[PDB]
Amino acid sequence: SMGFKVKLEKRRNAINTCLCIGLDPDEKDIENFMKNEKENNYNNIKKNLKEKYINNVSIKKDILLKAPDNIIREEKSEEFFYFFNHFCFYIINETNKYALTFKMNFAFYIPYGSVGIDVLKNVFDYLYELNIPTILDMKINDIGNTVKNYRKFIFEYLKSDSCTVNIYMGTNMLKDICYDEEKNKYYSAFVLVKTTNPDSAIFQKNLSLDNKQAYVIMAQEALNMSSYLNLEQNNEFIGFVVGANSYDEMNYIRTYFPNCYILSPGIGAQNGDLHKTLTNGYHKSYEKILINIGRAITKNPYPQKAAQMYYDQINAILKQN
Amino acid sequence: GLVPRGSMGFKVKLEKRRNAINTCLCIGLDPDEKDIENFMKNEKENNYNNIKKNLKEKYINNVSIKKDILLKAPDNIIREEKSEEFFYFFNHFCFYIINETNKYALTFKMNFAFYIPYGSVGIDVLKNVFDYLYELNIPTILDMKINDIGNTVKNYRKFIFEYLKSDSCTVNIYMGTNMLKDICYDEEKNKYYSAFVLVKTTNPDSAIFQKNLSLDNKQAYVIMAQEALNMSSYLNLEQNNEFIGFVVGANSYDEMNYIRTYFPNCYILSPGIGAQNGDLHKTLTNGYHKSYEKILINIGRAITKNPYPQKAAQMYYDQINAILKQNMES
Ligand SMILES: O=c1[nH]c(=O)c2[nH+]cn([C@@H]3O[C@H](COP(=O)(O)O)[C@@H](O)[C@H]3O)c2[nH]1
Ligand SMILES: O=c1[nH]c(=O)c2[nH+]cn([C@@H]3O[C@H](COP(=O)(O)O)[C@@H](O)[C@H]3O)c2[nH]1
């Protein structure tokens, strides 16, 4: 209803941060949560059950509301579903007060087949109820007729606020991601611009047009497409993914597209330097520089304290600027 | 000297099937909501003729997900299993297309995008479709254009190659080629897998990065093709009977010619004929290789939206084969 641009601004006004918490649970995370809960008499699951919005998830709610002892004995074929969903609710419950947005990477929810997609749906439902801005990190790409299916999955079924998109095929795909002509609906996306992987230079920097490196050409074309679609007129936007370890490019992008929205993964697990990243990407409307932190929170044995410290650090750095 | 079903690299599986059926037709299975709806409507009007034929087929008993539901009488689904109706008709539409057309297919390509928009239910269908194709021993491609950093992309590898047991998938390597180490190789199991990387695509604005960006007067698509091959060599794929190949759009004649000229023995997958109207003779000729399986021609909607998909598939098979013969007798 309000539009992601407005959602982000309003939440930033309430919580005064740009922390984006990544929720990418792996098999080990789920297995560890199960083992740990069994050893501590299900303390975190019990807390989850006292939360109000658990009552508003779409998929197999009755299963999720059952006591763990009973799941294990009477609904054993749902055990993985139950512990996977409860791990997610546990992370969200422990950390949401510090989060401007949550980013869920689709790759983590698919490798078990359908079960993880039911978890992902419930996670999006839970975040929707909590009014927390969401990002689906799926790096979608295809021809127009095909990508409309991703638009439906992401923006209609999950009701995500935004997604990540790989526009190497071209920018016209965005017309079938960020806009629904039939319904007059508009949606936001972050396009891959400069990524964190060690060999990112190979195509993103080493290729060029008119003495500008590819990542610059790609950012400008994404903005051209945003203008064409009139997204910002409709309280939505196309933004850029710029790796937290990519200081020169972050500096270049913020200088040359002064009011762009940037999503920056790669701090914590991948060594990115938080001070340098946030400084090079800084904007006074700091929802425009989302700092994504995943494993440094989700693989930390004290996730609430980990989130708090990133919140506190970001806010100290934001203050300097 | 005989290898059993599932126990050989994709290079070998493709070669063997190409020797068997002598074509390069790749049938695309991309069912949309209209297709599923229309299938349900048509079956309801004809007392489920096609579903009952699906139910006769031996390997329907070998799929993993909800056989109890898939094997029910269709009027029982409608009356007694309302919440399973969409799952049942979606899955049966897919089995129907496969049963009707597989004898003409060198490979089936399933585009992930079509299986995800209803949430988990389409992933169950997708899993059953892959299980069914594996039982029939038909070469498979999961068209998902996956990309991420290595630690994340391993999850797609698990989904595609371990869960679905796909033979291959499509990959977008704009992030870098190092991601391929986590897709085409599993270091824990020492298993190798095949992929097609995006090189030149069919969308109208495909030149904007693929042709406009360059390094030293080589266009991006050429550099990306070369870097993919360099990674294949590093990973020893072809020594392990797997490969990294290229997606080159059916409509991209000049690029198809360059790629086949400069990488003579590469594997090419070519979508964009039929519903997207490329010139088949022109595409197949520019991409031709005497080992036909190196120039896969994908046809999806022109078969799956035809009311007689078996005959549509035979017609494309025959049309392709005639062009293959022209090249063989040139
Ligand atoms: O669009 C992207 N461009 C990037 O350069 C990049 N680097 C990491 N990732 C993804 O972000 C998350 C990183 O999470 P960690 O904090 O756990 O490393 C995970 O979800 C990763 O898949 C990227 N996504
Ligand atoms: O990797 C790709 N590069 C391309 O240039 C391209 N063009 C179309 N497609 C996909 O192929 C299928 C087209 O199916 P139709 O015969 O029904 O149009 C569908 O699955 C489309 O998503 C492409 N995939």
Please give the residue range of the domain that contains residue A47.
Answer: 1-321
Residue ranges for the known binding site of A for UMP are 24, 103, 105, 137, 139, 142, 146, 196, 270, 294-295
Does residue B258 contact residue B248 with C-beta atoms inside 8 Å?
no
B248: closest CA of chain A, how far (Å): 12
Domain count, chain A: 1
Q: How far is residue A260's CA from residue A237's CA, in Å, rounded to a whole number?
A: 9
Residue A302 Cα to ligand 1 midpoint, Å, equals 21
Q: Is residue A204 lining ligand 1, measured as CB closer than 6 Å?
A: no
Q: Is residue B274 lining ligand 2, measured as CB closer than 6 Å?
A: yes
Does residue A237 contact residue A8 with C-beta atoms inside 8 Å?
no
Q: Is residue B226 lining ligand 1, measured as CB closer than 6 Å?
A: no
Residue B46, H or E segment: none
Inspect the interface and report whether the beta carbons of B204 and A170 lie closer than 8 Å.
Answer: yes
Please list every residue in chain A whose beta carbon sits closer than 8 Å to the beta carbon of residue B183: none
DSSP H helical segments within A242-291, as ranges? 247-256, 274-281
Q: State residue B110 phi and psi, 5-degree precision.
A: -110, 125
The structure tokens listed for A143 are 């021809």
Q: How far is residue A194's CA from residue A205's CA, in Å, rounded to a whole number?
A: 8
**Residue with the two structure tokens 């309000």:** A2
Please list every residue in chain A whose beta carbon sits closer than 8 Å to the beta carbon of residue B117: 149-150, 152-153, 156-157
Q: How far is residue B176's CA from residue B178's CA, in Å, rounded to a whole number?
A: 6
Q: Which amino acid is at A250?
A: M
CB-CB neighbours of B212 under 10 Å: 16
CB-CB neighbours of A236 under 10 Å: 24
Residue A53 Cα to ligand 1 midpoint, Å, equals 28
- Least Cα distance to B328 among B24, B11, B105 occurs for B24
Angle of CA points A26, B236, A200, to nearest 5°: 55
Q: How far is residue B25's CA from residue B236's CA, in Å, rounded to a whole number?
A: 28
Catalytic residues of A: 139
What Cα–Cα distance (Å) separates residue B37 from each residue in B28, B31, B40, B86? 19, 10, 5, 9
CB-based burial of residue A102 (10 Å sphere; 0-12 exposed, 13-18 middle, 19+ buried)? buried
Q: Is residue B160 lining ligand 2, measured as CB closer than 6 Å?
A: no
DSSP E strand stretches across B134-292? 140-146, 168-171, 185-186, 191-192, 194-200, 214-215, 218-219, 244-248, 268-270
Q: How far apart are the first and last CA of chain A?
A: 32
Q: Which residues pair with B132 in a beta bridge?
A: none
Does residue A115 contact residue B120 with C-beta atoms inside 8 Å?
yes
- Least Cα distance to B55 among B26, B77, B36, B25 occurs for B77
Residue A199 Cα to ligand 1 midpoint, Å, equals 15
The structure tokens listed for B250 are 């059916």
Domain CATH code at residue A229: 3.20.20.70
Q: How far is residue A122's CA from residue A126's CA, in Å, rounded to a whole number?
A: 6
**Residue with the two structure tokens 């290229």:** B246
A321: closest CA of chain B, how far (Å): 31
Q: State residue B269 phi and psi, 5-degree precision.
A: -115, 130
Q: How far is residue B200's CA from residue B210's CA, in Å, rounded to a whole number?
A: 6
Residue B179 Cα to ligand 1 midpoint, Å, equals 13
Inspect the interface and report whether the beta carbons of B205 and A171 lie closer than 8 Å.
Answer: yes
Residue A101 Cα to ligand 1 midpoint, Å, equals 15
A39: closest CA of chain B, how far (Å): 28
- From the list B65, B148, B224, the residue facing A203 with the nearest CB is B224
B217: closest CA of chain A, how far (Å): 10
- Least Cα distance to A294 among A37, A42, A101, A11 occurs for A101
Angle of CA points B243, B178, A163, to nearest 5°: 105
Which of A136, A196, A204, A273, when mutated, tests ligand 1's pocket best, judged by the most ligand atoms within 8 Å of its CB?
Answer: A196
* Resolution of the model in angstroms: 1.7
Q: How far is residue B17's CA from residue B7's CA, in Å, rounded to a whole number?
A: 14
Does residue B140 contact residue B107 with C-beta atoms inside 8 Å?
yes
Q: Which residues pair with B111 in a beta bridge?
A: B143
Task: Give nearest CA residue, ligand 1 atom 24.
Answer: A265
Does residue B270 contact residue B287 with C-beta atoms inside 8 Å?
yes
Does residue A71 contact residue A82 with C-beta atoms inside 8 Å?
yes
- From the list B162, B175, B212, the residue facing A192 with the nearest CB is B175
Q: Is residue B257 lining ligand 2, measured as CB closer than 6 Å?
A: no
Nearest 10 degrees: CA dihedral of A83, A85, A90, A93? -160
Does residue A135 contact residue A164 with C-beta atoms inside 8 Å?
yes
3-state helix, strand, coil in chain A (%, to 5): 55, 15, 30
Q: State residue A293 phi and psi, 5-degree precision.
A: -130, 115
- From the list B116, B177, B215, the residue facing A199 with the nearest CB is B177
Angle of CA points A254, A106, A195, to nearest 5°: 30
Which of B30, B200, B210, when mutated, tests ligand 2's pocket best, judged by the most ligand atoms within 8 Å of its CB?
Answer: B30
Q: State residue B207 phi and psi, 5-degree precision.
A: -70, -15
Maximum distance among all alpha carbons in chain A? 66
Provide the CB-side half-sphere exposure for B14 (13 A, CA): 26
Please list every residue in chain B whose beta carbon sits closer than 8 Å to the beta carbon of residue A208: 213-215
The structure tokens listed for A252 are 């270049």
- Least Cα distance to A57 among A86, A96, A22, A27 occurs for A86
Q: Is residue A294 lining ligand 1, measured as CB closer than 6 Å?
A: yes
